[PDB]
């Protein structure tokens, strides 16, 4: 994005050096007492938690450019015991402590608005998901799931709309299996060339309406390029 | 909430007057093209959405003091077409136009951080609810619901902690059968026309991530019940 690139150049102008990360590396762990504000620029990461039994609970996924924070900005206290695990073979991020951020945004309010609107996107996104879930069960959950991924990785090909993303990450359960079974049968999706294809976007729009509306409102350009 | 009092003063000094609202009344609705910023100073409300088939789904609940925004702060576009209805018998709130909020927050960094941290509280709440759900099924969600309920309105009693709230706010098929299971196991019991806690441990156990979220986001309120 453009605003994201401008914020990148701003951070670099204030001495924030971009750091690389190999897959599985922890950008920050739940035990680190330092509250960060990771501005993921390139790659993909996952926010996870770990319960008592030690099981890894994948909470959310983020694809740069995006902003993640381990502490509240007002009180600088932690927002949770989270772990930001990278999942791309090589990612590029900008790690900053909480106070350095706060002062940067205190002198330049445009980027303050940028990150503010990022968080608004995240909250309305959770809301649209929960709405699609409430109104159309796991069908709508799955429909919105692959709807967002075809919007962000949609390539209008003669065979429909190819999903331009690494198959390995795409791979990354009886109900969902039956649902995607009827999706494959009904033609709305096809597994040609072992790459996930989508040919009936209106079907995804119908049963994941609120996510579609969220994508239109928060990402109007990328939404319009496929309508 | 000390931060909310200062925000109230800072809004009123800039000519923003408190507004009153009654039950079943909407502070902003779905099709309103004007984007707002509601500072719910007092009262309880629910954010709902009406589907094209007329069905109304309840999406979120909010309690004062809190901040709920209907558009993006800079571009003033809608963030989502939603309705904010009042569920408490009465509520007080300040309604700010999105551009006016942009100006006011650009005129003061402290309250900027305040609204930003309310958004962060929302994000971490969603993450915690999702964790409890993905772990303990649909039981974790209702467990977290009852947990935060007890924390916000819990009052110590010899029988057990109790929520002091009218029966209306309390009430507001399979989920009901799960309530039956919990009531039979006696996680909480109903007496004297009111709901009474028995063992808060069950909820903390089956709604863990939300307990963490409430400990680190509302430590003062969390402490008194622990």
């Amino acid at each position: 994005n453009a605003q994201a690139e401008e914020f990148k150049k701003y951070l670099e102008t204030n001495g924030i050096k971009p750091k690389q990360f190999h897959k599985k590396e922890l950008i920050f762990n739940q035990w680190d007492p330092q509250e960060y504000c990771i501005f993921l620029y390139d790659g993909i990461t996952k926010l996870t938690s770990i319960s008592e039994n030690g099981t890894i609970m994948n909470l959310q996924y983020y694809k740069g450019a995006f902003v993640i924070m381990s502490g509240f900005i007002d009180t600088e206290t932690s927002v949770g015991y989270y772990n930001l695990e990278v999942i791309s073979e090589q990612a590029t991020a900008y790690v900053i402590k909480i106070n350095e951020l706060k002062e940067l945004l205190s002198k330049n309010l445009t980027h303050f608005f940028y990150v503010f609107q990022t968080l608004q996107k995240q909250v309305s996104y959770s809301l649209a998901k929960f709405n699609d879930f409430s109104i159309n069960g796991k069908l709508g959950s799955i429909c919105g799931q692959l709807l967002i991924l075809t919007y962000v990785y949609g390539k209008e090909t003669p065979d429909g709309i190819k999903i331009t993303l690494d198959n390995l990450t795409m791979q990354e359960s009886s109900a969902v299996s039956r649902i995607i079974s009827k999706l494959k049968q009904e033609k709305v999706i096809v597994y040609k060339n072992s790459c996930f294809y989508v040919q009936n976007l209106d079907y995804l729009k119908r049963y994941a309406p609120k996510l579609d509306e969220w994508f239109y409102l928060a990402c109007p350009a990328t939404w319009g390029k496929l309508n | 909430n000390a931060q909310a009092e200062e925000f109230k003063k800072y809004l009123e000094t800039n000519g923003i007057k408190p507004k009153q609202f009654h039950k079943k009344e909407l502070i902003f609705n779905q099709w309103d093209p004007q984007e707002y910023c509601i500072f719910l100073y007092d009262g309880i409300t629910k954010l709902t959405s009406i589907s094209e088939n007329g069905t109304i789904m309840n999406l979120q609940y909010y309690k004062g003091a809190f901040v709920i925004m209907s558009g993006f702060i800079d571009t003033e576009t809608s963030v989502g077409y939603y309705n904010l209805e009042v569920i408490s018998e009465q509520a007080t709130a300040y309604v700010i136009k999105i551009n006016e909020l942009k100006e006011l927050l650009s005129k003061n960094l402290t309250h900027f951080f305040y609204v930003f941290q309310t958004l962060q509280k929302q994000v971490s709440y969603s993450l915690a609810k999702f964790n409890d759900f993905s772990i303990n099924g649909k039981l974790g969600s209702i467990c977290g619901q009852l947990l935060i309920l007890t924390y916000v309105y819990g009052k110590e009693t010899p029988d057990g902690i109790k929520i002091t709230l009218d029966n209306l706010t309390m009430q507001e098929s399979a989920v009901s059968r799960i309530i039956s299971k919990l009531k039979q196991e006696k996680v909480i019991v109903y007496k004297n026309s009111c709901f009474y806690v028995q063992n808060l441990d069950y909820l903390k156990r089956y709604a863990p991530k939300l307990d963490e979220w409430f400990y680190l986001a509302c430590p003062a309120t969390w402490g008194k019940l622990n």
Partner: peptide
């Protein structure tokens, strides 16, 4: 659940 969901790549934002």
């Amino acid at each position: 659940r969901g790549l934002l």
